[PDB]
Amino acid sequence: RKESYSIYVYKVLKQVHPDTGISSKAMGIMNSFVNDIFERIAGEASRLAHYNKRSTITSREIQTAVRLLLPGELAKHAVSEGTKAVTKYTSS
Amino acid sequence: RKESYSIYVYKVLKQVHPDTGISSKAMGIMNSFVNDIFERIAGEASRLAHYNKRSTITSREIQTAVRLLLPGELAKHAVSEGTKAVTKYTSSK
Amino acid sequence: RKVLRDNIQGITKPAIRRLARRGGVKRISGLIYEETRGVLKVFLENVIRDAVTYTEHAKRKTVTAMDVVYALKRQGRTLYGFGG
Amino acid sequence: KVLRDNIQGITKPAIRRLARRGGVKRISGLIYEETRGVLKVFLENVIRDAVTYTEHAKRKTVTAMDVVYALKRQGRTLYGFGG
Amino acid sequence: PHRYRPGTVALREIRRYQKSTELLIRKLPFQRLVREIAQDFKTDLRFQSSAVMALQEASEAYLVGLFEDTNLCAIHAKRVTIMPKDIQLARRIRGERA
Amino acid sequence: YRPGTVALREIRRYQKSTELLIRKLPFQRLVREIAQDFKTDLRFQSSAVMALQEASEAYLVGLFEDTNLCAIHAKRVTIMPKDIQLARRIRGERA
Amino acid sequence: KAKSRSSRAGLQFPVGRVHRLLRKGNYAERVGAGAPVYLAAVLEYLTAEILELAGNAARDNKKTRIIPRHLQLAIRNDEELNKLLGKVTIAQGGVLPNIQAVLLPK
Amino acid sequence: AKSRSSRAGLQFPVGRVHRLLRKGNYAERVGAGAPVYLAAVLEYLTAEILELAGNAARDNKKTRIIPRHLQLAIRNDEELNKLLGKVTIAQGGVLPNIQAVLLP
Numbered sequence: 001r002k003e004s005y006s007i008y009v010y011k012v013l014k015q016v017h018p019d020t021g022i023s024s025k026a027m028g029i030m031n032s033f034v035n036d037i038f039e040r041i042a043g044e045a046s047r048l049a050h051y052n053k054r055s056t057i058t059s060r061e062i063q064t065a066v067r068l069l070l071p072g073e074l075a076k077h078a079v080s081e082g083t084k085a086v087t088k089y090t091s092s
Numbered sequence: 093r094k095e096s097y098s099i100y101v102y103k104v105l106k107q108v109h110p111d112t113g114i115s116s117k118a119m120g121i122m123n124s125f126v127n128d129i130f131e132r133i134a135g136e137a138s139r140l141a142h143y144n145k146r147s148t149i150t151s152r153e154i155q156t157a158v159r160l161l162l163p164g165e166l167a168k169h170a171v172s173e174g175t176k177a178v179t180k181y182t183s184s185k
Numbered sequence: 186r187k188v189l190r191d192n193i194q195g196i197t198k199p200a201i202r203r204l205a206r207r208g209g210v211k212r213i214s215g216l217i218y219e220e221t222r223g224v225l226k227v228f229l230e231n232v233i234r235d236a237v238t239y240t241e242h243a244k245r246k247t248v249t250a251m252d253v254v255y256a257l258k259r260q261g262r263t264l265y266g267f268g269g
Numbered sequence: 270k271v272l273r274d275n276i277q278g279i280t281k282p283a284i285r286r287l288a289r290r291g292g293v294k295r296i297s298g299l300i301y302e303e304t305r306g307v308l309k310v311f312l313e314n315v316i317r318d319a320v321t322y323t324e325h326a327k328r329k330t331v332t333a334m335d336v337v338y339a340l341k342r343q344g345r346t347l348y349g350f351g352g
Numbered sequence: 353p354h355r356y357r358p359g360t361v362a363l364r365e366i367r368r369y370q371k372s373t374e375l376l377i378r379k380l381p382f383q384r385l386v387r388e389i390a391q392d393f394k395t396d397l398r399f400q401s402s403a404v405m406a407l408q409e410a411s412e413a414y415l416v417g418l419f420e421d422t423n424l425c426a427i428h429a430k431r432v433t434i435m436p437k438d439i440q441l442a443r444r445i446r447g448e449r450a
Numbered sequence: 451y452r453p454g455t456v457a458l459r460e461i462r463r464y465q466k467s468t469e470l471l472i473r474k475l476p477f478q479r480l481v482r483e484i485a486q487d488f489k490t491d492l493r494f495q496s497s498a499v500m501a502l503q504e505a506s507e508a509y510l511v512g513l514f515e516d517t518n519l520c521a522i523h524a525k526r527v528t529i530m531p532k533d534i535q536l537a538r539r540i541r542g543e544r545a
Numbered sequence: 546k547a548k549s550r551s552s553r554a555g556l557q558f559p560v561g562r563v564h565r566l567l568r569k570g571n572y573a574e575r576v577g578a579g580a581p582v583y584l585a586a587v588l589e590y591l592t593a594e595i596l597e598l599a600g601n602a603a604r605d606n607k608k609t610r611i612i613p614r615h616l617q618l619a620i621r622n623d624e625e626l627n628k629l630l631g632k633v634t635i636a637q638g639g640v641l642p643n644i645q646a647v648l649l650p651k
Numbered sequence: 652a653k654s655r656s657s658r659a660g661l662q663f664p665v666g667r668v669h670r671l672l673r674k675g676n677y678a679e680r681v682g683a684g685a686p687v688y689l690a691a692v693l694e695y696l697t698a699e700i701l702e703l704a705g706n707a708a709r710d711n712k713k714t715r716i717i718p719r720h721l722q723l724a725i726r727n728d729e730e731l732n733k734l735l736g737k738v739t740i741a742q743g744g745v746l747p748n749i750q751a752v753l754l755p
């Protein structure tokens with residue numbers, strides 16, 4: 001009973017490698033991966049909010065969580081991707 | 093930031109070692125300890141409630157949490173203490 | 186409901202050797218087999234105890250894969266592939 | 270430009286006494302500099318995270334609790350600095 | 353290139369096992385070990401098959417990692433042969449018997 | 451006396467002691483330099499530097515313990531860079 | 546028919562579902578509207594990174610379908626993903642081929 | 652017995668622990684028994700460490716527990732050492748212990 005993201009990992013896979021499939025065992029790994037990362041980020045955003053006596057998790061808590069949790073370039077790119085998405089969404 | 097339990101720590105100290113004092117720096121260590129353990133247990137109790145789709149943290153979630161988080165022998169003592177307290181609290185109700 | 190015993194002996198010399206090989210090990214002393222059994226038993230006992238704790242908390246009698254995954258998380262190990 | 274090399278303010282004798290507290294009987298001359306590298310990585314890791322906390326709160330002063338939270342990120346729980 | 357001692361065989365075995373992903377402990381024996389261990393903590397526990405498999409994946413991954421560290425400890429002492437002392441050092445440093 | 455005897459008496463002395471072993475002001479300058487590489491105009495509370503010092507010393511002493519075990523394992527009494535590197539590798543601190 | 550939050554953000558991962566999962570976890574009293582867009586974008590970005598690397602490793606062994614082995618090769622051959630996933634076990638992943646140099650013949 | 656602590660036979664503050672559980676983002680609701688059980692565990696673990704730290708203070712002829720004595724208590728007790736295996740006690744130092752092979 002963990003969340004499935006299979007449809008979404010399929011779409012992403014088609015954008016990156018239109019050529020290539022993924023076995024269901026591999027999809028099971030990818031699902032564990034997305035759940036794990038969601039939980040780490042959300043957990044850290046929750047702590048940040050509590051530390052700062054904030055009632056609300058916003059994109060700022062997610063951004064800081066991302067910076068804390070992800071190493072090096074992965075974090076820089078993740079932060080750029082998050083920021084872009086919020087910019088697009090806000091415009092659109 | 094963190095919650096102070098100094099007064100309570102002092103009272104426990106008086107029961108276990110009535111003629112022993114405790115330093116300010118030692119009290120700071122004890123407050124960190126209490127907050128740490130509180131956070132660990134509450135955290136696991138929250139996990140347990142979510143896993144089991146329960147909206148409420150009860151004494152059952154605290155107890156399971158204690159059993160998960162503490163080493164076995166120490167867990168036995170803690171569980172007996174938690175259980176005794178809940179029993180007394182429920183009695184004179 | 187037969188009483189299972191001595192099943193640690195089912196972790197045989199060739200199995201342990203294969204594991205050491207995957208671990209890049211070239212040569213193995215004769216005393217490693219019994220050591221490895223003892224190490225594995227401790228690891229398993231710990232994980233199974235926690236798994237069963239989650240199982241009993243839920244008032245189930247069947248240990249599930251998610252009970253195991255939670256148990257492992259509790260030891261600081263994150264296992265992928267069993268969330269379905 | 271400017272020389273920024275404060276890691277060399279950590280002395281040979283300080284490193285030796287840390288090692289002695291660690292039960293070490295004898296020390297190769299090459300350990301001092303090795304130690305300095307490993308300390309600098311450790312502090313860089315913790316301080317990076319502590320300042321992330323500080324910036325998130327829009328503060329310009331790093332507090333003891335920022336450090337305690339950063340250390341918890343590296344899996345270390347420090348007692349004594351919550352007051 | 354050396355030619356066909358216990359060392360050369362050992363090296364082909366490393367290549368073979370590092371290439372593959374199959375579990376290396378026999379499944380039924382592993383299952384019986386799991387069930388025996390559980391027999392203390394509770395009478396009448398059943399395991400889902402995939403619970404046994406999870407336990408097996410985790411256990412093997414654990415052993416394999418521990419062998420890697422053990423191997424580095426042997427090598428540190430200028431040996432090629434792992435010994436219990438190597439396992440014990442690895443475990444102490446990892447914090448499992450600290 | 452023998453360097454061995456001196457070393458042993460030093461272990462005993464510093465294992466009984468709890469005081470911080472790195473000079474306060476040099477530690478402070480080191481923290482300030484590292485913080486300035488991340489963000490200029492940052493300042494530390496004094497208790498923040500002390501937390502960092504307690505943590506850093508605790509870490510090093512633990513690392514020396516494991517390093518020591520690694521030297522003994524190789525039948526040495528002298529710790530070497532390879533001993534630190536083995537300890538840190540098994541700790542997962544380095545790839 | 547209303548345009549999805551994901552579409553509006555330029556994402557494949559589900560903004561509305563992420564918002565909902567954020568609320569169900571009781572991480573805070575309130576969850577702001579931008580939080581799930583940001584989070585979904587990160588999850589998608591990581592997912593693309595790994596799939597990109599695993600698909601390459603599938604191709605490097607003459608394979609057209611990603612299996613756990615490929616995910617494991619991709620993660621552990623990548624310095625940053627290996628560090629992110631340092632305490633993770635990929636079931637049926639195996640290990641990297643790697644023998645210590647002293648064990649090999651001169 | 653008037654306060655919730657008294658009714659539970661505790662020194663640690665039940666009412667306060669309840670409020671902390673509710674304000675912490677742990678669940679939608681917290682039942683009345685939870686803070687009682689949690690207070691009791693905190694109180695018992697606090698007693699363990701104090702018993703042991705007071706013992707260490709007395710062994711060194713001291714009448715005041717300092718961080719040293721908390722460190723000695725924890726590290727010399729197998730169970731507390733396991734519980735607090737990733738904890739650093741500020742000013743706690745380490746246990747006196749030299750590896751046998753290093754002694755003359």
Ligand SMILES: [Cl-]
Pocket residue numbers: 057058059060576577578579580
């Ligand atoms: Cl927001």
Ligand SMILES: [Cl-]
Pocket residue numbers: 176
């Ligand atoms: Cl009683």
Ligand SMILES: [Cl-]
Pocket residue numbers: 196197198199
């Ligand atoms: Cl056999």
Ligand SMILES: [Cl-]
Pocket residue numbers: 211212213214362
């Ligand atoms: Cl062999």
Ligand SMILES: [Cl-]
Pocket residue numbers: 002031032035254264265266267268269
């Ligand atoms: Cl999962």
Ligand SMILES: [Cl-]
Pocket residue numbers: 280282283473
């Ligand atoms: Cl000096």
Ligand SMILES: [Cl-]
Pocket residue numbers: 294295296297457
């Ligand atoms: Cl020396």
Ligand SMILES: [Cl-]
Pocket residue numbers: 094123124127337347348349350351
């Ligand atoms: Cl604290």
Ligand SMILES: [Cl-]
Pocket residue numbers: 373374375
């Ligand atoms: Cl298999």
Ligand SMILES: [Cl-]
Pocket residue numbers: 383384387
């Ligand atoms: Cl069976």
Ligand SMILES: [Cl-]
Pocket residue numbers: 257262263264409410413633634
């Ligand atoms: Cl695992």
Ligand SMILES: [Cl-]
Pocket residue numbers: 430431432433
């Ligand atoms: Cl050898």
Ligand SMILES: [Cl-]
Pocket residue numbers: 435436437438
């Ligand atoms: Cl041996």
Ligand SMILES: [Cl-]
Pocket residue numbers: 340345346347504505506508738739
């Ligand atoms: Cl620390």
Ligand SMILES: [Cl-]
Pocket residue numbers: 525526527528
């Ligand atoms: Cl030597």
Ligand SMILES: [Cl-]
Pocket residue numbers: 530531532533
């Ligand atoms: Cl060296």
